[PDB]
């Protein structure tokens, strides 16, 4: 079954940041979702697997972050 996670794109001051072009990819290279961050946390439901959050572009004035890999385990545990 699927596991609930939340993704937050923030600035250096701990505040949610709008305007980043984001994607979520699985270990086989399939794109699960693409979106533009909107200044709020974004929920996902994901089946077990290895995934990567990848920033395609940052809002004007910000640096692109390194991708974040994580694993959703068979039992709902998520490891970063």
């Amino acid at each position: 079954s699927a596991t609930h996670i939340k993704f937050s794109k923030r600035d250096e001051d701990g505040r949610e940041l709008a305007g980043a072009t984001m994607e979520l990819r699985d270990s086989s290279g399939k794109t699960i979702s693409t979106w533009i961050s909107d200044g709020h946390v974004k929920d996902f439901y994901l089946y077990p697997g290895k995934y990567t959050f990848v920033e395609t572009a940052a809002p004007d004035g910000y640096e692109v972050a390194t991708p974040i890999e994580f694993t959703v385990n068979e039992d709902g545990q998520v490891t970063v």
């Binding site: 993704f7 600035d11 959050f53 004035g61 910000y62 972050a65």
Partner: peptide, 15 residues
């Protein structure tokens, strides 16, 4: 409760 929070930080460009 207990939903994992995955946080990606966008640093400022020097300008």
């Amino acid at each position: 409760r207990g939903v994992p929070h995955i946080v990606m930080v966008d640093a400022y460009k020097r300008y």
